[model samples]
Target: MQKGLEIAFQTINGLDESLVQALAGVTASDFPDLDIKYNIFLVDLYGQKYFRILFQSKKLSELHPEERKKVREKFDENSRMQYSELMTKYHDLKKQGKIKDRPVKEVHEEYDLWEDPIWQYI
Candidate 1:
């Protein structure tokens, strides 16, 4: 992890540690052969903050075609579900004005996980 990124995560108040743990657990337990290195960063989107997890692996690209498909499917499903829940919580707080600095929009947009490069081959 980059020093600046680590500092950014540390500065966020009320960040959920379990989410990070969950992501790490998934990578470690489900795809041990991939040797994934998780790079988590704080992202600012639509005047709000969110954590994005990126998976980096050298062996990922060398997997069998079907196995690679399976890996991607499982990871995407788990990650998307978790992030959806997080977004819901964030929007709720924003609605209640618990998070300040920006006026809550009447329509809350779901954070686009696909916008970021979730996977990196090294």
Candidate 2:
């Protein structure tokens, strides 16, 4: 959770508590600025060494339909995933409403969003 991606806190909050805590070690230093929409998306970048794997994967799918289709087919190939399973657990979690966009309270009157008492340290 970096300064700009503080907004992703709510997204992180929306994920399973156990899952989120389990994921912290993988993200802390490795993904200081990665988007918090889904754990799978973070892993996607780790595999590709690219910033926007979502966009890249999408564009690749568009450019190479058969390749993308076959790659996606690996999602249901196996549970052991010795070759590739496409992170199906997360895909199912996403479909099951586990990983989703959460509402962020932006119009609060009592607390000032801009007031950061710890700003001086950074």
Candidate 3:
């Protein structure tokens, strides 16, 4: 493996670990499955793991009121700071042309595993 790529991988791994830890404390699973699934769709469409924090963050925005409340109860200042840092990285990568917008149909066709509601009654 190339040394440069190895170092970059290590750095990114640390950043991802920190970001995951920062957000892991929040227990906000009281969401509609379809809602969560849609966010997953968004992430898969982007197909860039580096900016996945944004996808999950977007999902948070659509959370149920009680779900948000629970998340707020656990998110500390440190978590907020780490998440902010991750967002900055996200923006930086976006500037570098790392983020791409894929069609929703493209992602759904490729990644959707569960049965769609349209087919449920059949």
Candidate 4:
């Protein structure tokens, strides 16, 4: 293992929130605008064994420290930070084993699954 590298889970937490915020912040119909109506973050339940404080989605749940070779095989860590077409990505990740099936159900039947605002569907 690398002796000088320090891992930070806060980065992931920030990304999830930031991604949502970025999406919500989108208004001007143009590049970087929040055009996408839905978003989610799936963290593997099994990932806890490797990173107790870390939270991931279906794309990064099955990795252990010993299995460094599979990290890239699992999910494009860079892409996960800035991804597109999640449903497709899920399928891809599932094949890779970096993540599992438990994705963060942020938006269900339209964004915010639990909110169930009940008047619209994006």
lDDT values, one for every candidate: 0.42, 0.28, 0.31, 0.30
Q: Give each model's clash number.
A: 0, 0, 0, 15
CA shift at 14, candidate 1, in angstroms?
Answer: 13
**Cand. 1 TM to true fold:** 0.38
The best candidate by TM-score is: 1
Q: Which stretches of candidate 3 lie over 4 Å from their true place?
A: 1-16, 21-47, 50-67, 76-78, 81-122
The residue-by-residue lDDT of candidate 1 on 1-122, one tens digit each, is: 11101111121244445445544544354553544444555556578765544455554444356665555555445544666664554454344323212122222245643343432220
TM-score of 3: 0.22
- Flag regions of model 2 displaced more than 4 Å: 1-61, 78-122
lDDT of 3 by residue, 1-122 (tens): 00000000111244545444223212122232323322212223345422222123333444356654454434333344656655654454444323333332222434333333212311
TM-score against truth, every candidate: 0.38, 0.21, 0.22, 0.21
| TM-score preference between candidates 1 and 2, better one | 1
What tens-digit string does per-residue lDDT give for candidate 2 at 1-122? 12112211111222234333323333333344444333222212223421111111212323545554454443223212332222343343344323333232223224433223212211
Worst 10 residues of 3 by lDDT: 1-10
The order by descending lDDT is 1, 3, 4, 2
Q: Write the per-residue lDDT of candidate 4 for residues 13-98, one digit (tens) a residue.
A: 43455333322222112213322233343333333411111222333323465544443333234325445644343334345323
Cα error, candidate 2, residue 42 (Å): 19
Error of 2 at 91 (Å): 18
